[PDB]
A paper describes a structure:
ZER1 and ZYG11B, the substrate receptors of the Cullin 2-RING E3 ubiquitin ligase (CRL2), recognize N-terminal (Nt) glycine degrons and participate in the Nt-myristoylation quality control through the Gly/N-degron pathway. Here we show that ZER1 and ZYG11B can also recognize small Nt-residues other than glycine. Furthermore, we present the crystal structures of ZER1 and ZYG11B bound to various small Nt-residues and uncover the molecular mechanism of non-acetylated substrate recognition by ZER1 and ZYG11B. In conclusion, we propose that ZER1/ZYG11B not only targets Gly/N-degrons for proteasomal degradation, but it also has the ability to bind a defined selection of non-Ac/N-degrons by a conserved molecular mechanism of substrate recognition and target their degradation through the non-Ac/N-degron pathway.
To understand the molecular basis of ZER1/ZYG11B-mediated binding of non-Gly Nt-residue peptides, we determined the crystal structures of ZER1 bound to either SFLH-, AFLH- or TFLH-peptide, as well as the crystal structures of ZYG11B bound to either SFLH-, AFLH- or CFLH- peptide. In line with our SPOT-array results, ZER1 binds to XFLHVGQD peptides in which X is either Ser (KD of 1.3), Ala (KD of 1.6), Thr (KD of 3.1) or Cys (KD of 3.9) more potently than to the Gly-starting peptide (KD of 4.2). The free α-amino group of the Nt-residue forms hydrogen bonds with the side chains of Asp556 and Asn597 in ZER1 (the counterparts of Asp 526 and Asn 567 in ZYG11B), respectively. The main-chain amide of the third residue on the peptide is anchored by a hydrogen bond with Asn553 in ZER1 (Asn523 in ZYG11B). It is worth noting that the side-chain hydroxyl group of Nt-Ser makes additional hydrogen bond with the side chain of Trp552 in ZER1 (Trp522 in ZYG11B), suggesting a critical role of the Trp552 in binding of Nt-Ser. Apart from these direct interactions, a network of water molecules occupies the bottom of the cavity and mediates the contacts to ZER1 via water-mediated hydrogen bonds. However, on the other side, the Water3 in the Ser1-binding mode has to move down and away from the corresponding Water3 in the Gly1-binding mode (~1 Å) to provide enough space for docking the side chain of Ser1. Simultaneously, the Asn633 shifts toward Water3 to form a hydrogen bond, thereby leaving no space for Water4 in the Ser1-binding mode. As a result, the Water3 mediates contacts directly with Water2, Gly593, Asn633 as well as Ser1, while in the Gly1-binding mode the Water3 together with Water4 establishes a contact network with Water2, Gly593, Asn633 as well as Trp552. These rearrangements of water molecules might explain why ZER1 is able to recognize other Nt-residues in its narrow substrate-binding pocket.
Author numbering:
A (entry chain B), B (entry chain A): 514 to 759
The structure:
């Protein structure tokens, strides 16, 4: 259990603490815990994502990135949080600024904490791209050059990477499978499932099966808009999950 | 997404800071933050509960309770943390001393932050009772005395109490439903569900339904040996979750 985050104003409490550490130019255990807490309490919790945005959280995220460019665990926590914010469709338009898209695109090349910072940057952009080209506006970088960077990011990750992430539900990722708007978003979501069932099949094969990932992955194989590399990947997820279903 | 991992260096930073504020005899914003941080990172996270105990957590809890006997927010954070610790079967042996059981049973009548201190003291004791009488040994007060203080406390709580608590999973509470060792533990768990679906059905009716609470509550009603008081509370939970459903 935990306290009542809304009644306690707990998101604000963490952002006020982050602001104080940033001005003290200190990224210590307390700074990093504050971001880990926001990451955890935004998990499938849109009102907390919304409080983060409305308390000027993005500025704090960007100022911490600049002030602590090499603090890898700090970046992992900040990006876990942003991955949760990006799952809220009603909030994603606030992410569509040149300043923000620039940061996410650049983090696709992050080697911080293995692949976690690049992975969540890619997931943020995967949900953004899922809204389609109208949503992108005149943002520089070009939607195509970011999409190009996403394919490169995904393909650079060790498929057997051990992970510093967990999911109570695959629902937000599965969102990106039955869609032709954004093949790259579909490819990121397919890699995400493939990585987890390869390394952690005991935990994630049954979650994927129960939540209906099997037909969805079959549909990708017959989907004109799906890329060959996505179709072959989904075949291998289905295969891992079948060696488990016995 | 989330990450519920042990954080040995942070558990230790929080405890060493609590020790410092103890000796300074100031229960300030930092004192209360440290206990709330421990509450947060022990949520569904047994590893942090284990390091809490290994690094002298229980004595710091006891001392803080003695030093600051009227700091109700402190008590609420402290008992939220201890409620999380007590969920860990492997760790409950470290709680079986007369000193601790007397402390916890003497919090059953606490009026601090509504019912939260009373509720969490009862939860700690419910998991302890679930372990059976052999686990109690020679601890004082006697198990039967604490059991009656437990029924009394539960009955004293406003069934529609507003709450300063949050659960992301009901797993540890559901643990207490299909069991015949401790009726008072079963009753505590049923109340915990009943209050939450009664005050916040939109959050907790779907969670209870999703994690399989309905067959468990139905089983209690069908259990020839179950207490009718508990049967009827279980039935009201089923009723409200059915009223929630369409």
């Amino acid at each position: 259990s935990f306290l009542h985050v809304g009644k306690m104003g707990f998101v604000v409490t963490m952002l006020k603490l982050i602001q104080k550490k940033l001005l003290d130019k200190t990224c210590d255990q307390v700074m990093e815990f504050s971001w880990s807490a926001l990451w955890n309490i935004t998990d499938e919790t849109p009102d907390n994502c919304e409080m983060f945005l409305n308390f000027n959280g993005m500025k704090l995220f960007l100022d911490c990135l600049k002030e602590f460019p090499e603090k890898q665990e700090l970046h992992r926590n900040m990006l876990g949080l942003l991955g949760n914010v990006a799952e809220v469709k009603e909030l994603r338009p606030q992410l569509m600024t040149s300043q923000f898209i620039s940061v996410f695109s650049n983090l696709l090349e992050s080697k911080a904490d293995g692949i976690e910072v690049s992975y969540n940057a890619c997931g943020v952009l995967s949900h953004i791209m899922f809204d389609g080209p109208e949503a992108w506006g005149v943002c520089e970088p070009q939607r195509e050059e970011v999409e190009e960077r996403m394919w490169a990011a995904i393909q650079s990750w060790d498929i057997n990477s051990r992970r510093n992430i967990n999911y109570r539900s695959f629902e937000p990722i599965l969102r990106l499978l039955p869609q032709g708007i954004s093949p790259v978003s579909q490819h990121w979501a397919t890699w995400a499932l493939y990585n987890l069932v390869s390394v952690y099949p005991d935990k994630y094969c049954p979650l994927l099966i129960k939540e209906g990932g099997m037909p969805l992955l079959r549909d990708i194989i017959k989907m004109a808009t799906a890329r060959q590399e996505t179709k072959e990947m989904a075949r291998k997820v289905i295969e891992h999950c079948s060696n488990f279903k016995e």
